Each structure stands twice: as C-alpha cells, then as structure tokens.
Design a binder for this molecule. Structure first.
Ligand SMILES: Nc1ncnc2c1ncn2[C@@H]1O[C@H](COP(=O)(O)OP(=O)(O)CP(=O)(O)O)[C@@H](O)[C@H]1O
Ligand SMILES: Nc1ncnc2c1ncn2[C@@H]1O[C@H](COP(=O)(O)OP(=O)(O)O)[C@@H](O)[C@H]1O
Lengths: 250, 252
C-alpha cells in the first residue's frame, strides 16, 4: 500500500524552467546550423529530437497548471472591504474556482480582475435606495466566473448595475480627434465600448507614470494581450455590464 | 507590479515521464551524432556539447525534486508492527531513527515491502519469547530499531533487533546438504559468505523453488528488489546479540 504525491518548491520549478528555455534555444541553433544539409534521415534524427523537447516541455506545462483559486480566494474579502468603503451593498459570487491555468497566467491575471471587480462595485452598482426605486433587486449581484470552454479559458465579470453610458463615450471620442458624428452612427455596440481600452480615455485625469505600464482599463487589455488573450465588454443602461476575458489554454 | 500566489505540488505520474523523456533525450542526441558519422559533419559539436550540459543539468534537478523524506513509508510501520507483534504474542519496543532522511520517491514504495519483510522477520524469528529471553539473561524487552541516514552519496537503511541472532551453523550444514559446499570449503567461509546463502533463491526455504513462480516471499527477492534500484544489501548477526540488516541506495 502506497502514500502519494509530492511537494516541490518554486526555485526548483524556476531552475527547471530556466533550463527548459535554454533547451529550446540550443535545439533551435542546431536546426539552424544543419539547415543547409538536405540529408533524408538526418532530418528524422533532428525531428525526433524536436519531438522529445516538445513532449518534454508539454509535460512541464502540465506541471505548470495551477487552480485559479490562488487568486480568486484573495477576492471575497477585498470585494467585501471595497463594498462598505464605498457605501454599497453587493452580493458577490465566485464560480469555477477549480478551473486550472498556467502558473504564469494566474499570477498575471490577478490585478486586472481586481480592477474589473472594483469597477463593478464603484461605477457599476447603484446605491441600494436607487435600485429599490427603479424596480431592481435591492442588492446588486457581482459574478466572477472562470470556466474551461473550448480550447480557451473564459473569465467573466458581470454585474447588474447602472451599465455604461455609450453616448458619453461617443461624445468624448469625438471631443478629441477619434471619430466624427458621421462615423459615430456606424459603430456597433462593442466597438463603442472598445474605446475604454484606449490609453487614458479621459474623463479622469493625467497620471505621472512610474515603475509600471499604466493605471486603468488600457492596462487590463495590455495584460490580457501579453497572455495572447482577448477581451471585450457587453452593457446596456440600467441592466448591467459583463466583461469577458478569453485566454489560450495550454 | 506582479501579483503573488504560493508554492505548488504535483504527482509522480508525469514526474517519471520527465525522466523517461529525458532518458530518451540523451539518446536523441547520440543518434544525431551517429548519423553525422555516416555523412561526416563535425563543425557542430559546440552546440551538441551544451545539449549534454543541459540534459545533465536538467536530469539532475528533474530528479532533485522527487526526493521525499522516508516518513511517508516509515509512519505506516509502527502499527503494522504492534498488531502482528501481539499476533505472535511478543512484545516489541519499536524505535525509528533518521525518519527525516530523504531519497527518491520511486524507491520508497518498492522498498516498502522489503522493509516490512525484514521487520516481520525480526519479530518472528528474530525476537525470542520473553521466557526464553529472561532465561538468556537479556532484558525482557525486545527492541526493534528501524533506521535511515545519509552516508556519502548513499542512503543507509538499517533494520536492527536484539534476538537469538542467526544460526550460521544451520546455514552451513544446510548448504552442505544441498551440495553447494562441503566441510573443507565451509571451514574457510567468512561471516559475509555464510549469510549470503540466505540470498540464494532456493536456500532459506524448504518449499517453493522449481515450478511454483518467479515471484515468491523470501530474502532472495528482497535482494533483487534492492539491486533493481542498483543498490546493495548486507547482513550482520552475532549469536544471541541480534540481527542487523543494511540496505544502501544511490542518489546521483
Ligand atoms: N462595470 C462598470 N460599470 C459602469 N461603468 C464602468 C464599469 N467599468 C468601468 N466603467 C466606466 O469606465 C470608466 C473607466 O474605468 P477605468 O477602469 O479606466 O477607471 P478607474 O481606473 O478610475 C477605476 P477606479 O475607480 O478603480 O479608480 C469609469 O471611470 C466608469 O465611468
Ligand atoms: N532478523 C532475523 N533474525 C533471525 N533470523 C532471521 C532474521 N531474518 C531472517 N531470518 C532467518 O532467515 C530465514 C529466511 O527468511 P525469509 O527468506 O524472509 O522467509 P521466511 O521468513 O518465510 O523463512 C528464516 O527462516 C529465518 O530463520
């Protein structure tokens, strides 16, 4: 009878990934050197080596896999704290905590999600008294969801709050040389909302920028795109807002 | 700034797949050089040297992670002992030392039953009943000691009891009956040579040898398991002192 599986520490995985990278580099310089030769079974000897390195890396990536709980678990308290600090009442729900990602993806996607969450609590959800007056459920609900679907990983943040004012976006868009009135009426809903990812889409204020990349919504897309992922927004007045983030799953 | 997470853990099911692939990786290197012999191309060797450097460096730390302390088998022993000790009605004072000494995981589950066997031995044939024990002027309390430690590049596992010891003469005379040796040859035998008869496949038993199995319970298969890990096993037994079995396993 047997007792199972084993704990390691980062430094080893760190040391492992370093050599993995060096292995990739070395394999590439070999293929470049012998690229001039056209020998038949030399190709198969090289292709075999590549196949090994790939399958070797492919296993490493399966070790890299990590539950998104590492980040999600930090949230319910922060959402709780943010809610009362901003004088709001929110019912916060997490779904798909078990969904597993590459370790790199998880320790990147953390801050952008926290941002989107704060956005929902701050600008999204109306004060309780306003919700009751409009016929909406007294307490706003906030859903952070992560699912394995297709060959991608889909993370969604959804709220039933105010929603986003598209006209305010369009007017600001024209306010500083982006479009005019004519090419404004030709815009789909999503590409209107896509203005929010423009660097410093300004109703806010200038920022002096140190040590980082940026401050707000333009950074979310930046992080997502650094992971070769995708992002867009759905919203309409007095119904709610949903941000969808898709990440390539390997 | 980034966001912090924690430390991880993983299974061995694909951890052995690393070694398997990396063991298959060094093969892929040589196969290239060998196909570089047929057509004679030598200017690459600087790049193929790093591959050996990397694979080795890779091979080391890939296996350097799978070292786990020995308490993941040792801690299931003490009540696997006390229950069969009373099963044979004998008292055993079980003591484990060096439980925090570590070795490869793929070893510890294949070293498990052999260790259990040596323990089962020491209880049964090793430790004599208390009446016989107090009649032998020995302390009435039977003390069985399981031990593990670092020594050089090897891990030393020791199962030591204080029992009747092993009758070396019974071994010699049994060996003479089987025609392995005779009195002339037996007179020159060292204690190691004598005890090594216990590792002879059809020696220490009266029953199972010819057409029964390839798999049997005995000290013969215990040795095979040890050197299936490319290790070494040794026995030391003084008479009425006790029996001390030693297993040494490699590292790198
Ligand atoms: N869930 C949501 N519902 C309503 N409006 C939202 C929203 N998410 C963002 N917005 C709007 O988009 C504009 C910009 O968001 P951005 O993320 O760049 O701002 P911010 O960095 O100022 C967040 P904070 O309040 O956390 O400082 C907001 O100022 C708000 O008017
Ligand atoms: N710790 C020990 N003390 C005394 N005798 C032992 C010890 N271990 C093994 N022996 C002797 O070695 C013989 C072979 O044991 P083994 O090969 O394990 O199978 P079995 O225990 O079924 O005989 C036993 O008959 C026993 O007399």
């Amino acid at each position: 009878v047997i007792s199972q599986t084993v704990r390691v520490d980062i430094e080893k995985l760190d040391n492992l990934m370093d050599l993995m990278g060096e292995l990739v580099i070395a394999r590439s310089r070999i293929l470049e050197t012998l690229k001039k030769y056209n020998i038949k079974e030399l190709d198969e000897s090289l292709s075999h080596l590549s196949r090994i390195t790939l399958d070797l890396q492919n296993v490493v990536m399966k070790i890299r896999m990590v539950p998104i709980s590492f980040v999600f678990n930090r949230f319910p308290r922060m959402v709780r704290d943010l809610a009362k600090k901003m004088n709001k009442e929110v019912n916060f729900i997490m779904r798909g905590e078990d969904t597993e990602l590459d370790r790199t993806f998880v320790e990147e996607i953390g801050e952008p999600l926290l941002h989107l969450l704060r956005n929902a609590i701050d600008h999204g959800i109306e004060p309780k008294e306003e919700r009751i007056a409009k016929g909406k459920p007294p307490i706003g609900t906030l859903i952070l969801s992560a699912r394995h679907e297709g060959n991608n990983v889909v993370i969604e943040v959804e709220d039933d709050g105010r929603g986003i004012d598209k006209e305010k976006i369009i007017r600001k868009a024209i306010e500083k040389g982006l479009i005019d009135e004519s090419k404004a009426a030709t815009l789909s809903d999503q590409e209107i909302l896509n203005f929010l990812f423009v660097p410093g889409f300004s109703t806010k204020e200038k920022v002096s920028e140190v040590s980082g990349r940026g401050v707000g919504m333009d950074v979310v897309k930046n992080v997502v795109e650094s992971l070769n992922g995708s992002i867009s927004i759905e919203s309409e007045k007095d119904k709610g807002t949903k941000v969808t983030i898709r990440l390539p799953l390997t």
